[PDB]
Structures are given as structure tokens and as C-alpha cells.
Design a protein around this ligand. Structure first.
Ligand SMILES: Nc1ncnc2c1ncn2[C@@H]1O[C@H](COP(=O)(O)OP(=O)(O)O)[C@@H](O)[C@H]1O
Ligand SMILES: Nc1ncnc2c1ncn2[C@@H]1O[C@H](COP(=O)(O)OP(=O)(O)O)[C@@H](O)[C@H]1O
Ligand code: NA
Lengths: 173, 173
């Protein structure tokens, strides 16, 4: 009766929301109950005035982890899309969630910018993307995630297939 | 399938946790998926250093309500045990939750004080804690809750039967 959480982490513009939406539609089409936690949409609903300091982002991540823990332990496949840039935060998520599937959409900064110049500009202008020494400074890459997909080399359909294959191998479906 | 939320509100020692646990056991024995959401427990887990300004308490109310909204929209009965002292913030919860069951354990101060294993009333009277709802914090009683139980006059099994009777009348099972 315990379900699982697909935790999609990666820098802004890597393709997290695109993959999250496609996974949601795929698993719903196979008949499963699924819930999508869009990190930015959760922020807008719960605390739209919260800033983007390290301590504020950590509190937001802890809220998302707890929502995903409660949903998944009641049998709901939960898909999370959050930057979650520090390994320590994702290791906290992993210890809180019994069946944790860490998915890393890996994509060079040059491609991330080319795919959405206006969106990245707007987020950086608002202080949502930090870059005291540059854009690529902050994110800490997962060392052994369940899935890595290179979104500059794969289609979204291939990314979905890679995640599903791993879910099958884990026995989660 | 949309499920419902049992929102148990009232001052410390009124019997919220006891009723929450008994309803959980009863509804689980009937075959339902149920989740217990203790509002102060969530605050202590997620952000134990969060203050108690009006803005921070409003944030926390929104977090608890959204957890319940997400669980109940995926078919999970959510039983919320939460002091929730303000009528207006329970109206927010009522608007967010499609099938909302507000339950008020009404209990005179004398009896709450005799049902206080954590010693909260004693701590509040000696100034070790402040703003205890039902002592030096005011509690705003519900105007028209779905259920009022006088927990100094009813047994827990009688309270469960009263809640269940109203759930039957509401058609929420
Ligand atoms: N596999 C892919 N191939 C081509 N473009 C992609 C791919 N994945 C995402 N994109 C595009 O990249 C941009 C950023 O994706 P998005 O999912 O919004 O990123 P994030 O949620 O990580 O910020 C969007 O324009 C999206 O359509
Ligand atoms: N109807 C009742 N009759 C007798 N004792 C009760 C009743 N309801 C609750 N209690 C007792 O009151 C005490 C405090 O109850 P609790 O549910 O912890 O209060 P709250 O969660 O509102 O702070 C518990 O020890 C519990 O067993
Ligand atoms: Na409602």
C-alpha cells in the first residue's frame, strides 16, 4: 500500500516540469492515481511572499518532502518538480520517503539558456535563480541518482521511457 | 474520488487527539484509507523555529489546509487535529476543502485542566509558555460546526458514534 515518489531535481531550465507533466500523463493513462507537486506552484499557494535565501528554500523543500511523504504512504504516486540544489536536502528527502526515485535531467547551461532565454532572464531578475559567481555555481549534481537523463540528447518520450524502465526494475509498478 | 476532511478544533485538553485516534481506528476498520494530520506536530516537524506572528500562523494554516486538500482529493480521509483558534481561518479551510466536517470538542476549563498529561495549563499559569489557547489565548467557538461533542459528558465511543452519524447524514462516506 506504500507508493513511491519521483523526485525530479536539477537547475532551472533543465526540463524538470516538462518531464514531470509527461510522467503524470503517462502514469494516469496506465490507470494509476498520481499527484504532481510543482515546487513553484506550491510556493505560490502557500507562501507567495517567501524569499529565496538558502534558509527559505530549505523550508520550502521540507514542506514538499512532507507532502510527498504523506501522499505516497497512502498509495498515491507523487511526482515532485523542485530545483533542490544541495545533496544534503535530497538526502533528507530520501530518508523521509520510503520509496524514493531521484531523477536528474542533466543539461548544459548553454542549452538551458537557448531553450528559454526570456524565462531564465525573468527568474534571475527576480532573485529566484542565484548566481553570485555565475549561474552554474550553486547546483550540486546527484552522485548516484536512480535515473539520469540528458535532456539535450533525448526526447521527452525517451526520458519518460528511462524513468519507467527504472520503476519496473525497482519493482515499483 | 473526492474524500472528506474531519477538522477537529478546540483548546488544549478538549480531547482532539483522543477523538482523532478513535475516528482513525473506526474508519480504518471500515476499510478506508485514512491519514492523521496533527497541526502542531506538522509545525514542530517542518519549521520548529518558525515564530507565531499573524503572518506566520496564517502560513502554517495554509500548509495544513493544503496537505488535507491534496490527500482528500486523492480519496484519503484526512483527520486534522488542530487547535485552530480563529473562526476566519477555519472558514478558509472550509472553502478550500470540498467535503469539510468541522468537529468541536466542547469542554469546560476545569475538565481540560484534568486532562492535561503534558502539563500545558500549569506551564502557562507559571509563564513557562504563553498564548496557550483556552487559557491566556482566546478560542473562537465555531458558529455552526457539523458536530459539537461535550467531551466532559460523553465517552469517546459516544463521540465517535456522533461523528459517524453526521458523516452518514452528510453522505460523505
Ligand atoms: N527533452 C527536451 N528536448 C527539447 N526541449 C526540452 C526538453 N525538455 C524540456 N525542454 C524545453 O526546455 C525548456 C525548459 O523546460 P522546463 O521543463 O520548463 O524546465 P524546468 O522545469 O527544469 O525549469 C522548456 O521550453 C521545454 O519545452
Ligand atoms: N470523552 C472523553 N472522556 C474521558 N476522557 C477523555 C475524553 N476525550 C478525551 N479524553 C482524555 O483527555 C485527555 C486529553 O485528550 P487529547 O485528545 O490529548 O486532547 P487534545 O488533543 O485536545 O489536547 C486524554 O488523556 C484523553 O484520553
Ligand atoms: Na467546503
Amino acid at each position: 500500500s506504500m507508493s513511491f515518489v519521483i523526485w525530479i531535481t536539477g537547475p532551472s531550465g533543465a526540463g524538470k516540469t516538462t518531464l514531470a507533466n509527461a510522467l503524470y500523463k503517462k502514469l494516469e493513462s496506465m490507470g494509476y492515481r498520481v499527484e504532481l507537486l510543482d515546487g513553484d506552484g506550491v510556493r505560490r499557494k502557500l507562501y507567495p511572499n517567501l524569499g529565496f535565501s538558502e534558509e527559505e528554500r530549505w523550508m520550502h523543500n521540507r514542506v514538499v518532502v512532507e507532502m510527498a511523504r504523506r501522499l505516497s504512504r497512502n498509495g498515491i504516486i507523487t511526482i515532485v518538480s523542485v530545483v533542490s540544489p544541495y545533496r544534503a536536502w535530497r538526502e533528507y528527502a530520501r530518508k523521509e520517503i520510503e520509496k524514493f526515485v531521484e531523477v536528474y535531467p542533466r543539461c548544459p547551461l548553454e542549452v538551458r539558456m537557448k531553450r528559454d532565454p526570456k524565462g531564465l532572464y525573468s527568474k534571475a531578475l527576480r532573485g529566484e535563480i542565484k548566481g553570485l559567481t555565475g549561474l552554474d555555481g550553486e547546483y550540486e549534481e546527484p552522485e548516484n541518482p536512480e535515473v539520469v537523463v540528458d535532456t539535450d540528447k533525448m526526447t521527452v518520450e525517451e526520458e519518460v521511457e528511462a524513468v519507467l524502465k527504472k520503476l519496473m526494475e525497482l519493482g515499483y509498478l
